[model samples]
Target chain A: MQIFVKTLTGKTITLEVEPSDTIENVKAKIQDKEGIPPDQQRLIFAGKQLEDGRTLSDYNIQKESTLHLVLRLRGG
Target chain B: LPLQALPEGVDQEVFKQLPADIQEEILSGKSRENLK
Candidate 1:
């Protein structure tokens, strides 16, 4: 199944992952695509934190669904 | 309906679910509650 991730900055990207792929894996992939740090990425699905290793079935994920991840950067 | 015609008050909780810019869009009359 394919899932889409949208950044707060308005960038949207899509990728295909097996039903077995965990939410965390998608986060990592998004990090590569968005050039955002893993620690800074806040992956949210249905307004909740998408924890690592949580399978699609575990979270009731669906194809063509959109996941919103906000990036928070630290500055002095 | 006009902006002044909109019923008073904004739903903060529901507004929070929307993006920051979207809040601006609604308030700017580019979009409205009735649209959704």
Candidate 2:
């Protein structure tokens, strides 16, 4: 299914995502479409931080849900 | 203006079907819930 990823700049990108895709895979796809690399991308859903090591199904995200994307933070 | 590149693994044909306003919202960098 498709979902909207919201960037820090309030940029909302439309992505075709699947539960089978790993979280890291999702981040890479985000980079492919949004230009923010995986290391720089942080995804949070349903009030918890998402880890790249797991699949999106682990989070059990629902359709029409919003993912709050957080930047990895300033050049640290 | 150049068309946005399709995300990796995304089917180009399917993505192409997105409504014009959705495309506009993407290009505009701010998508609100105004689409019907």
Candidate 3:
């Protein structure tokens, strides 16, 4: 399945995903594709927040699902 | 109905899923509320 991860800046990152993939797994992929680490990526779906431990299926995410994300840059 | 041309800079895979209504909306610019 595919997912649309929209960032706070309104930039959308389209990604290929498996239902069995964990939240952390998706974040890792985003890190490579967008250079934003999992630590700063707050991924949300259907107005609900997601945890790294849960797989996409855990939230019943379907094909073409749009998962919104907000990034908080690392602070010194 | 035949869909309009794909919006530039947007992913083809994700674009079609928007359905034509949203396709046109984004084609023009963007929206909210109904965006969901």
Candidate 4:
């Protein structure tokens, strides 16, 4: 399935992934592509957190599903 | 911009649209001691 990821910096990236893939897997890919650590990435879809342990299918994510990515703030 | 560095010009509306808990999480990342 294909999904859209919109980053906080106003960047949008499309990804092709499996519905069986865990959120952590998606995070890993995003981390590799965006240079944002998996721990620092917060992904939300339909106003809900996408848990690392859950598969994309668990979220009922469909084609063209959009996920919003935000950075976990750093520095004091 | 350095890797992992936050970008400037965050759209306030976008921030505003986020859930309150998430907004708090972003603002409270370092500390809440300085917040008034």
Candidate 5:
């Protein structure tokens, strides 16, 4: 199933990802697209952190699920 | 401009730098009935 993911920069990026991709894998994809590191990623869904290695099924994410990767500003 | 939802925690800083008149307008939005 295709996953709809939004990066922290407010850019709308869509990907065709399978169910096998863990949340951490998605994070890497996000970093690849947004040029941000995992440490700077502030991924929240329904006001909670999306833990690494958690399967999309663990969160009941359906095919074509939309996820948001909010970014955190570093440095002064 | 950001197409997605704006980040929180940074609004207060922006709010602080606004002119007094604009600040008054912003504060008015925070009122109970005006929150909608």
Candidate 6:
């Protein structure tokens, strides 16, 4: 499946993933690709937060699903 | 100014689940520009 990640800074990155992939797995990729840690990444889909333990299919995230990613910095 | 509410279009339930500081940051309207 293909996923689209849009950052708060209006940056978009696309990734090819599997349905069995966990949200945590996706976060790890973002860490290496976007320099944002999993803990600091807030991923939202359908206006709800996606948990690390959940699989992409758990949220019914299909091909071309768009996720909103916000970076929560350590401090202001 | 103190944040008395969540962002205009954000769901309250979803916003409540966020960390306290992050909730404040999102409400600050500072990140709005970045969304564009």
State each model's TM-score restricted to chain B.
0.37, 0.34, 0.37, 0.34, 0.41, 0.46
Q: List the residue pairs that clash in candidate 3.
A: none
Q: What share of the true interface contacts does each candidate keep?
A: 0.00, 0.00, 0.00, 0.16, 0.00, 0.24
Query: What TM-score, to 2 decimals, does candidate 2 have?
Result: 0.59
Per residue, candidate 6 scores C-alpha lDDT tens digits across B1-36 of 223554444454444544554666677643333234
lDDT to native, each model: 0.58, 0.59, 0.65, 0.68, 0.53, 0.69
- Model 5: what TM-score? 0.55
TM-score of 4: 0.75
On TM-score, the leading prediction is 4
* lDDT by residue (tens digit), candidate 2, B1-36: 333543222333432333443344334432222221
In lDDT terms, how accurate is model 4? 0.68
* TM per candidate: 0.59, 0.59, 0.64, 0.75, 0.55, 0.67
Error of 6 at B23 (Å): 5.4
Candidate 1 docking class: incorrect
- Interface quality of candidate 4 as DockQ: 0.16
Docking class of 6: incorrect
Candidate 1 per-residue lDDT, tens place, B1-36, comes to 234422133344333544554445335422112212
Q: Worst 10-residue stretch by lDDT in candidate 5 chain B?
A: B27-36
What are the C-alpha RMSDs, in order, of all predicted structures? 9.0, 12.5, 10.2, 7.5, 11.5, 5.7
DockQ of each: 0.06, 0.03, 0.03, 0.16, 0.05, 0.22
Clashing residue pairs found in predicted model 4:
none
- lDDT string for model 1 (A1-76, tens) is 7888765444568977666778767767877775766776667667666677678667787888777655444331
Candidate 1 vs candidate 3: the TM-score winner is: 3
Query: Model 3 Cα displacement at A1 (Å)?
Result: 2.2
Candidate 2 wrong stretches, greater than 4 Å:
A72-76, B1-36
Better of 3 and 5 by lDDT: 3
Q: Looking at model 2 chain A, which ten-residue stretch has the lowest summed lDDT?
A: A67-76
Would you list the clashing residue pairs of candidate 1? none
lDDT tens readout by residue for model 3, B1-36: 222543333444444444333445445533221212
